Design a binder for this molecule. Structure first.
Ligand SMILES: Cc1ncc(/C=C/c2nnn[nH]2)c(/C=N/[C@@H](CCC(=O)O)COc2ccccc2)c1O
Ligand SMILES: Cc1ncc(/C=C/c2nnn[nH]2)c(/C=N/[C@@H](CCC(=O)O)COc2ccccc2)c1O
Ligand SMILES: N[C@@H](CCCC[NH3+])C(=O)O
Ligand SMILES: N[C@@H](CCCC[NH3+])C(=O)O
Lengths: 363, 364
């Protein structure tokens, strides 16, 4: 195929060390084959949880005991489980724009879900305070999709809000947090909390592969108590997959991989920005590009988003429109992911985009 | 002394890691990866990769006569996630009914979702249609190929009474849980209940987690059109089975490795069951009643003994014999009945195992 991907929901496969991953799986398998049908703790194998605990304490400042952690095949199963540990009449609140899939999950569960618009610092604490929800879903590292990084002041506002009344919860979806360009790392919301009002949720899908689904969540001890009272849950990650993750982490292959990828995506992001800036000269507006694996581009042009995307599809440019992320007019806005984008396709990538916005490039 | 490690297991909740072709599984995974690596980076179709679903569909039509299209099938990491999903596709206020004795874990899942769950006793033909029509549930959970745990194979005639019952009123459904259906022994090679479902009241539930790599959970669910339509209305589900685990399973099947393994295992289990039956019959000479064999990986033993089912169980730990009593499969009182599972039982251990059991039962 001659497709070029500006997709945010695909991941790199050319730079993921799949041979290392398989070697770790062989090493795990050799270490624990006798017990493979035995290590089935519903929360995840303890040592896997401890390995992830150590990792996210180092790289995110998350503080927690392995016993608080729950591993799962993907963020959806963990979220669904979460909605059953939280009070059943909890009013939820989601960033708009945001993760519509999760919006739909909460609606389908019959939950009330308020939509909290963004401002320059991320999820609006004014809309939060006005609408008085019980549970926040927020993406502080790199707002999904707008790309805004929640500054520390706004984190503190959200935590003060959770702290002012019993039984308010912040679900911190730290998706896309493994990378930070032209700015340093901000400690996680969970890390700043002087209390225990944050559920930390992380995923390995952006850093290993969507193909494999591994996610986890760190419960505040009281939601852990409700979880432990259930008595019937089964782990959804295969034991060998968990042990492979453990070996991949404790061998150092994981941290080696992230470091190399941090450099790769930084240079890719820079070059892709320069190329968008030369091709569009000033008629592109780029925002949300200080972290994560995508940013936003707004375009000064006359066609609809449904049209610009319909042309790009014809021109074999995989790209998505910002309208997809309304939970529910202006100039067209698109999501440029660059995780799957080959460096050698950057120049030809913007062209096709510079042509999907209308149909040409006369110069 | 009394070697502490010398445990013999009669437990049903197992699968012989020893006998699984682990190297063939990894070679299939490697072949899948060579063919499709540039595809792991994509998002699986939410139902599961089509070609995986198609391979499973071809398999279960051959091996069970299930009649379905890959389009109807939903892959998931274990039966529980699929059952949770199912409870959300079925009407909120649906009234469920499960076999008693049965699978406590699914009972707990349903009750924790706030569902009314009826418990339905067995007769000689399995789940009691008479109790079903008395207690008036909407959705049945049943194990027709080999009732868990009594081991009764529901005969065609009772299958038809269930199908008739479901067709009589709107919003009835039959969940066919076809666990441990990869094995039958010399009788009752009867196809899936779903193969008779002229009116689309059946949801077929199958699983590989007994057949494949220990610790791996791959299950699937075949949905009738109205529930499939309800599933497509959601628009937000993410496939829980790793794409590469799906592609390995597909290679395992289409390379023939999967069926080769089942033929071998089936043979192994038929002989092990035979040898274990001959031994129980020799040791107990009629003071034992075996029922619920001819399929699966466990059967039931009723014992000719003044001892308590709980006295036998506690003496059994005292002999390093891991065994389970029928009493543990009540959801929520006479001759003692035990579940003999021979999944993780060594042929070396058959003669010792029944002799230990004889002293669990009688004390001498
Ligand atoms: C804020 C947020 N929170 C969780 C997830 C999903 C998590 C997960 N964790 N484990 N499994 N799934 C997503 C992304 N969702 C998909 C597309 C969004 C959409 O356009 O709908 C992309 O999925 C991935 C693709 C490649 C790599 C990693 C994720 C997300 O934006
Ligand atoms: C009627 C029925 N339906 C599905 C499943 C499991 C499905 C699955 N697939 N993937 N993930 N979960 C089981 C599980 N039974 C286990 C629990 C025993 C208990 O405590 O009662 C024991 O293991 C087995 C023993 C004998 C046969 C099969 C399994 C079951 O009984
Ligand atoms: N434990 C044996 C009996 C030993 C003494 C009589 N043969 C049974 O049968
Ligand atoms: N005492 C066992 C051995 C019989 O009888």
């Amino acid at each position: 195929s001659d497709w070029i991907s500006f997709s945010h929901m695909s991941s790199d496969t050319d730079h993921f060390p799949i041979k290392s991953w398989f070697r770790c799986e062989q090493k795990a398998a050799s270490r624990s084959y006798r017990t493979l049908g035995d290590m089935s703790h519903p929360q995840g194998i303890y040592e896997v949880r401890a390995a992830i605990t150590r990792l996210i304490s180092l790289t995110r400042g998350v503080k927690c005991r392995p016993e608080q952690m729950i591993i799962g095949a993907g963020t959806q199963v963990l979220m669904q489980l979460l909605t059953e540990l939280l009070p059943k009449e909890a009013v939820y609140a989601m960033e708009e724009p945001g993760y519509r899939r999760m919006y739909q999950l909460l609606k389908n569960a019959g939950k009330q879900v308020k939509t909290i618009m963004l401002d320059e610092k991320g999820m609006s604490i004014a809309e939060i305070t006005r609408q008085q929800p019980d549970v926040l879903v927020t993406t502080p590292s790199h707002q999904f999709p707008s790309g805004t990084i929640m500054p520390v002041s706004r984190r503190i506002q959200l935590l003060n809000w959770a702290a002012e009344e019993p039984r308010r919860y912040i679900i911190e979806d730290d998706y896309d947090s493994e990378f930070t360009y032209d700015v340093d790392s901000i400690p996680a919301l969970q890390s700043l909390d002087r209390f225990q009002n944050v559920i930390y949720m992380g995923t390995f899908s952006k850093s290993l592969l969507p193909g494999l689904r591994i996610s986890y969540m760190v419960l505040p001890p009281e939601l852990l108590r409700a979880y432990k009272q259930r008595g019937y849950d089964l782990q959804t990650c295969s034991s060998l997959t968990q042990l492979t993750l453990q070996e991949f982490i404790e061998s150092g292959e994981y941290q080696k991989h992230i470091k190399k990828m941090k450099q790769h995506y930084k240079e890719k992001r820079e070059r892709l920005i320069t190329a968008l800036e030369a091709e569009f000269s000033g008629e592109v507006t780029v925002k949300g590009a200080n972290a994560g694996l995508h940013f936003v581009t707004e375009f000064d042009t006359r066609r609809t988003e449904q049209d610009i995307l319909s042309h790009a599809a014809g021109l074999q440019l995989e790209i998505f429109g910002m309208s997809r992320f309304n939970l529910k007019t202006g100039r067209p806005a698109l999501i440029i992911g660059f995780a799957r984008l080959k460096e050698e396709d950057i120049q030809e990538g913007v062209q096709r985009l510079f042509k999907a916005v209308y149909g040409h490039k006369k110069i």
